[PDB]
Ligand binder design. Structure first.
Ligand SMILES: NC(=O)C1=CN([C@@H]2O[C@H](COP(=O)(O)OP(=O)(O)OC[C@H]3O[C@@H](n4cnc5c(N)ncnc54)[C@H](OP(=O)(O)O)[C@@H]3O)[C@@H](O)[C@H]2O)C=CC1
Ligand SMILES: [Zn+2]
Lengths: 125, 96, 86, 208, 460, 297, 115
């Protein structure tokens, strides 16, 4: 009832992707950086897979931005790094992974503002 | 105030005009180039500066709900005139 | 035929690089004493066998492994490469 | 609770919970989980091998007799090991009720076809094969139903590009309609609308 | 420093910081934030060759590549040379290294000068910031010689300021009395003071003796002057005294060097000879200017009818004095590797595409090799990075900063040659804020930096 | 080089090839294929048309939005020619007529109009001009057609020194007048014909536009094989399953096709000529209700 | 472990048998299709195209992937038998209207930024 086959999964032949968009593209697996314009951190929770930037040019008429690759707007969401890496390997895409960056904890204290001899004494408030 | 390009074309309010060597001009030959004659910058330049005797004025663009969101303009800087961010109108305190 | 440069890739914590490490810490300076104009690059590997690259004239390159080599062994190997004997 | 809030029904909530527990008790071999929504919707999560039994039970049991198949669809979640999620929506006219059955599969594991249970599933299953690539075993005729003939790829997968890979035009050299690699005069503008400052504390996840 | 490039319909909109707790904390400098305006002006878009009138005219890629390849095939040896600029990536550096090696040349130089005497660039720790930016926060005393970190490395100075405010760091300086946004102890301006620190007569030697974790930093500006090797020897002697007398605290790594350009550390790691003295001693008859815009080499100090090739992205002091011009890509237009002053390697990403006929730098060099018949093995970016791993395997580890300590070897190699210090004060180029806005080709091409300079010189 | 003239994209419909072509006589048999090849790569085409726009209606799908611009002109007038080629960097001349007309005889069609086009293209700063004339065009020809063709070649060479002259022989195509003409007849054994495929000529013109050193050269586009007229007509009638224009055309078709081995051909442009047998079925499938003709080399 | 649910075959021999069956069916269908849709290709060219489409997937070593490919191939074969497809669809296999994309480094370097 069970094949018990021992081989790495590869569904490349069944997805219908053209051959050039498989061995040439380079996916990036990462946690998006926090937008420094805002202090919220709800967009840095999941992992994202995104493809590399290709050529965009100006349309001779109307001056719009024209592109030629299909995977320009394709961004995938994953719960963990391992899930994203497994998906990338299964689909036959070469990937680059960089580890999650978490802000290290800091020792905040209001009373350090009004210091008797240290330099943390604030000039105003 | 519509200016004319050195080639002979009309320059839009954004300053757009094909230069001598640009081939795209061929799209206008035997046809016309659409340029709006009314320039908003010139039309708003000729508006009179309103005189109010209050330190802070309000502007809603005229018409109430048919204008733009209501804003408040400070007139303390006597060097210049307070300008509405939406309408472009000018206000200024009665110096002397 | 003319040696242009040599590069030693050694790993920091691997034990198979230990002898190579010793070589530096004991005789690298002395080798620079003998060879004031030959660039002797030393670089860092990570879970890779220690290696020695010799780059000759016209870009010809030849590498030799240094895994589990002793300090006297790598001393002899560098002498062989510098003197041109094979 | 003011007129701006959708009112809750508790009688139906309790009834659906009791019936879900009943179905769970009868079929412990396949049922993995039972849930009731806050808006009184009952959904059952089962093992893939129990599609034919469980559905049959729900169609044929005197207490259930869910005679109608409202809809059959699939949901693609790439982050799961079993990528595809097969959803069966059933309607019972005798008891005026609705149920949902949920199953999981992947690209290579097939699903038994429920044509022997509901005829309505036939076309639905075809659509799934056309749109997600999920294979249904023992189907009378499994083939594409929506896409063009010879279309490569399954468009409703989350990794399929929105504009596809090829586009059609007419060529006077060959005097026919041909397909070429897609090129857009204006590329689709991708908008990042997700905001920080999460909205619903009720759905917060542990920080692992 | 890590950044986020915000683009819109294939056009760079703005630059924002990116949080890295070890490099840039959370911020970027004004030049980094507002110099992207220079990427849209004075751009090189097509290849150019000299016409019969002696002026530069546009041409196709084949014509320019053949014109360069003819001279490359005709010459050989030291008659062929190259200089690497301050905005060049490791890919193009190794590409040009291999290309000129295939024609048997070793004149691979950089505009900035690092003393090659003693160990030179053979030991990696001889020219890096070994204490690291995140390690500045653990020091208790710090000595800065011949540098102005406020304009030479703004985020490094910000980290020093943070450690000064929070860890009660003690800062002392040798050089011109510039303002560093925090108070420091000014030892003096003459390099002789350094010698006193080695001798022990100057009391700052005693003050630094008791320091549990002392840090010494020497800037490349002090190394650019003619007596740079003597200065490096003196600072190394100071660090030797620190270790032997006060005792080896452990893996503290007191010796540090702070760089000014992003392309220096990678070139030093790739075996490039720092400084342009090799070109001066043996003038070449064909010269490659890989983004070289420092103005160090003019046509006056080259042989007549010399062949100059400029490959870059901006029209600057180095372009009009060239014979063949090859338009390249900017850092916002290619996936490229840069190694910071800590020795940490990081790769950029493609935000937009190069304008017009501009191509990637390593691709240009590889095509030139193919045309000249000295075809290089690598064909794709991964193959280039495999070559980089071959030459220096730490250029492919994209977040590591750690490295072995070889201070003792380089130190005892530095004690052979004894050049005397000059009697000139250590005056850095970055005396005032007005000297910080324009430093490279991208900055000089921007209206924003021009506006900043005009506002600084006169303000309303 | 006028940055807006730099190629961009991937050579598709919406790409930019940097070619701005004015194709005179684009409403003809060769004009449609030339415009199709120019538009499928993303180039901008100016189509100057004399006829009603209804007859130009089929050219519109060949290009993307704004890539094809249709303009009226008169051969007798120089201002119209000037304003059609004002902004083009490539000019292609495909103006030709096989018969006499009370307004245009052979001299105006093949001498005066090409001379005006070449002169205006030179005065306008056009970089490339491509001119088409018959292969058998000689001054000493009995026919006024080919004599006028030769005079036009000489005059366009004089006016435009960097003009590229193409001399295709008996092009055969779905909408041609060679296979259809023979199939509509429903004399030889000494005359030899060397027909050339329509797509081969289209690709040759495109490559000549692209080719940098094909400035002043003269090409002769000919097919792979030389055919005796009798067996060629036999094969034409056999493919169609069929049992086997005033004066100039019969004289032209009775003349043998010249051989000019010194001139470069399609091989110089990297094109493998398509044999007649492969496309004969495509052309003649519409004349209905195997044993190819023997060749001489 | 690594035990999975089969589709049609248990090991590679049965999958190879099914591939051979499908190849036989396509080979027998090629000339009938060439005549019926009134093609411009020859039968040898069509069978060469069928061989190329088969050889494209010659690197698969998973019986599940192989027999799913076989299922698909029977689907297009069934589309072709019943003339569900138009003339255009059959050609879509030949890319007759597409320009040739060069593969050497110099050509790609000259044409554009595409790697
Ligand atoms: N077998 C062949 O056809 C080969 C053709 N020749 C040459 O190739 C060229 C093009 O061939 P082809 O396309 O088949 O010819 P066509 O008969 O198909 O039409 C030629 C074009 O020239 C225009 N034209 C013709 N006469 C005039 C005129 N008096 N004034 C303005 N425009 C005119 C026509 O436009 P309109 O619709 O208004 O008439 C038409 O669009 C010609 O120069 C021909 O001599 C080369 C070898 C043989
Ligand atoms: Zn207003």
């Amino acid at each position: 009832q069970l094949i018990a086959v021992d081989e790495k999964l590869d569904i490349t032949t069944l997805t219908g992707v053209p051959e050039e968009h498989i061995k040439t593209r380079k996916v990036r697996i990462f946690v998006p950086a926090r937008n420094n314009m805002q202090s919220g951190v709800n967009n840095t929770k999941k992992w994202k897979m995104e493809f590399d930037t290709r050529e965009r040019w100006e349309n001779p008429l109307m001056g719009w931005s024209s592109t030629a690759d299909p995977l320009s707007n394709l961004v995938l969401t994953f719960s963990t790094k391992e899930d994203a890496v497994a998906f990338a390997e299964k689909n036959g895409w070469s990937f680059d992974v960089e580890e999650r960056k978490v802000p290290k904890p800091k020792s905040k204290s209001y009373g350090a503002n009004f210091s008797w001899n240290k330099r943390t004494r604030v000039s105003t408030k | 105030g519509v200016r004319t390009s050195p080639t002979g074309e009309k320059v839009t309010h954004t300053g757009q005009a094909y230069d001598d060597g640009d081939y795209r001009r061929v799209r206008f030959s035997d046809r016309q180039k659409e340029v709006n004659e009314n320039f908003a910058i010139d039309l708003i330049a000729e508006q009179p500066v309103s005189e109010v005797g209050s330190r802070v004025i309000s502007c809603d663009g005229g018409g109430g709900a048919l204008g733009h969101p209501r804003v408040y303009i400070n007139l303390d800087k006597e060097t210049k005139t307070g300008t509405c961010g939406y309408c472009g109108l000018q206000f200024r305190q009665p110096h002397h | 035929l003319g040696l242009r440069e040599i590069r030693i890739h050694l790993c920091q914590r691997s034990p198979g690089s230990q002898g190579v490490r010793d070589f530096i810490e004991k005789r690298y300076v002395e080798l620079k004493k003998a060879n004031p104009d030959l660039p002797i690059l030393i670089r860092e590997c990570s879970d890779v066998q220690p290696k020695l690259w010799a780059r000759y004239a016209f870009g010809q390159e030849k590498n030799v492994s240094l895994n589990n080599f002793s300090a006297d062994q790598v001393t002899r190997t560098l002498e062989n490469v510098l003197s041109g004997k094979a | 609770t003011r007129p701006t809030i959708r009112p809750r029904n508790d009688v139906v909530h309790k009834q659906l919970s009791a019936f879900g527990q009943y179905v769970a008790e009868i079929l412990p071999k396949y049922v993995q989980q039972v849930q009731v929504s806050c808006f009184n919707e009952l959904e059952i999560f089962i093992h893939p091998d129990g599609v034919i039994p469980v559905l049959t039970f729900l169609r044929d049991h005197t207490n259930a007799q869910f005679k109608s198949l409202a809809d059959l669809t699939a949901v693609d979640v790439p982050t799961r090991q079993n990528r595809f999620e097969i959803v069966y929506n059933l309607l019972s006219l005798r008891f005026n009720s609705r149920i949902r059955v949920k199953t999981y599969t992947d690209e290579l594991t097939p699903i038994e076809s429920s044509v022997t249970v509901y005829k309505a599933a036939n076309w639905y299953e075809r659509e799934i094969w056309d749109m997600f690539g999920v294979f249904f075993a023992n189907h009378p005729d499994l083939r594409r139903i929506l896409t063009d003939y010879g279309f490569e790829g399954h468009p409703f997968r989350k990794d399929f590009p929105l504009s596809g890979y090829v586009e059609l035009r007419y060529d006077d050299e060959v005097k026919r309609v041909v397909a070429e690699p897609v090129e857009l005069a204006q590329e689709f503008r991708k908008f990042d609308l997700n905001s920080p400052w999460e909205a619903f504390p009720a759905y917060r996840q542990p920080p692992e | 420093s890590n950044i986020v490039v915000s683009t819109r319909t294939g056009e760079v909109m703005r630059i924002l910081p990116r949080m890295h707790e070890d490099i840039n904390e959370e911020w970027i400098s004004d030049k980094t934030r507002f110099a992207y305006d220079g990427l849209k002006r004075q751009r090189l878009t097509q290849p150019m060759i000299r016409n019969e009138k002696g002026l530069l005219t546009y041409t196709t890629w084949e014509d320019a590549l053949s014109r360069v390849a003819g001279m490359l095939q005709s010459f050989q040896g030291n008659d062929v040379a190259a200089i690497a600029g301050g905005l060049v990536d490791a890919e193009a550096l190794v590409a040009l290294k291999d290309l000129l090696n295939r024609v048997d040349s070793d004149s691979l130089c950089t505009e900035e000068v690092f003393p090659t005497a003693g160990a030179g660039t053979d030991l990696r720790s001889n020219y890096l910031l070994n204490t690291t930016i995140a390690g500045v926060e653990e020091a208790d005393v710090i000595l800065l010689v011949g540098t102005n970190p406020r304009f030479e490395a703004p985020l490094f100075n910000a980290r020093i300021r943070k450690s000064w405010l929070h860890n009660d760091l003690k800062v002392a300086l040798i050089g011109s009395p510039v303002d560093l946004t925090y108070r420091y102890d000014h030892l003096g301006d003459s390099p002789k003071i350094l010698q006193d620190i080695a001798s022990g007569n100057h009391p700052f030697s005693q003050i630094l003796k008791e320091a549990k974790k002392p840090m010494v930093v020497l800037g490349s500006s002090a190394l650019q002057r003619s007596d740079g090797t003597a200065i490096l020897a003196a600072v190394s002697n100071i660090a030797q005294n620190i270790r032997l007398s006060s005792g080896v605290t452990g893996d503290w790594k007191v010796m540090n060097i702070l760089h000014r350009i992003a392309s220096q550390v990678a070139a030093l790691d790739l075996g490039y000879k720092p400084g342009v003295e090799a070109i001066r001693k043996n003038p070449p008859k064909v010269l490659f200017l890989l983004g070289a815009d420092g103005g160090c080499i003019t046509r006056q100090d080259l042989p007549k009818d010399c062949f100059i090739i400029y490959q870059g992205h901006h029209g600057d002091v180095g372009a009009p004095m060239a014979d063949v011009i090859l338009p390249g890509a900017a850092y916002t237009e290619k996936s490229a590797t840069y190694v910071n002053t800590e020795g940490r390697a990081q790769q950029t990403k493609v935000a937009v595409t190069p304008p017009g006929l501009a191509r990637e730098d390593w691709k240009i060099i590889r095509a030139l090799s193919e045309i000249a018949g000295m075809t290089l093995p690598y064909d794709t970016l991964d193959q280039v990075r495999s070559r980089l791993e071959e030459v220096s395997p730490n250029l492919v580890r994209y977040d590591d900063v750690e490295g072995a300590n070889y201070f003792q070897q380089a130190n005892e190699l530095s004690k052979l040659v004894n050049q005397q210090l000059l009697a000139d004060p250590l005056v850095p180029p970055q005396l005032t804020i007005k000297d910080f806005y324009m430093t490279d080709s991208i900055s000089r091409a921007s209206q924003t930096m021009a506006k900043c300079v005009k506002a600084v010189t006169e303000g309303i | 080089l006028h940055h807006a003239l730099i190629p961009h994209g991937k050579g598709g419909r919406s790409s930019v090839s940097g070619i701005v072509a004015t194709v005179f006589g684009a409403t003809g048999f060769l004009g449609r294929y030339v415009v199709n090849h120019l538009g499928r790569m993303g180039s901008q085409v100016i189509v100057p048309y004399r006829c009603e726009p209804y007859d130009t209606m089929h050219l519109r799908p060949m290009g993307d939005l704004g890539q094809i611009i249709f303009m009226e002109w008169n051969g007798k007038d120089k201002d119209s020619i000037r304003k059609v080629v004002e902004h083009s960097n490539v000019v292609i001349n495909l103006v030709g007529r096989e018969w006499e007309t009370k307004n245009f005889d052979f001299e105006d069609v093949f001498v005066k109009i090409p001379h005006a086009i070449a002169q205006v293209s030179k005065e306008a700063g056009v970089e490339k001009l491509i001119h088409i004339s018959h292969l058998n065009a000689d001054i000493k020809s009995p026919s006024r057609y080919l004599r006028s063709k030769a005079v036009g070649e000489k005059e366009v060479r004089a006016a435009f020194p960097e003009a590229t002259i193409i001399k295709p022989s008996d092009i055969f195509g779905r909408e041609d007048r060679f296979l259809n003409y023979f199939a509509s007849m429903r004399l030889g054994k000494e005359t030899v014909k060397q027909p050339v495929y329509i797509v081969d000529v289209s690709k040759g013109i495109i490559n000549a536009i692209k080719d940098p050193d094909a400035k002043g050269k003269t090409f002769a586009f000919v097919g792979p094989n030389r055919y005796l007229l009798f067996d060629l007509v036999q094969y034409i009638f056999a493919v169609a399953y069929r049992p086997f224009t005033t004066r100039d055309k019969v004289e032209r078709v009775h003349m043998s096709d010249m051989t000019l081995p010194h001139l470069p051909g399609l091989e110089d442009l990297g094109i493998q000529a398509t044999p007649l047998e492969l496309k004969a079925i495509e052309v003649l499938r519409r004349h209905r209700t195997v044993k190819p003709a023997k060749t001489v080399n | 472990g690594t035990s999975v649910k089969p589709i049609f075959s248990r090991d590679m021999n049965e999958a190879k048998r099914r591939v051979r069956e499908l190849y036989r069916a396509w080979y027998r269908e090629v000339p009938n299709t060439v005549h019926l849709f009134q093609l411009d290709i020859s039968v040898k060219q069509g069978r060469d195209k069928v061989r190329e489409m088969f050889m494209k997937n010659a690197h698969v070593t998973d019986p599940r992937v192989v027999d799913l490919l076989v299922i698909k191939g029977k689907m297009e074969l069934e589309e072709t038998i019943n003339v569900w497809k138009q003339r255009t669809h059959i050609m879509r296999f030949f890319h007759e209207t597409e320009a040739p994309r060069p593969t050497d480094f110099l050509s790609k370097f000259y044409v554009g930024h595409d790697p």
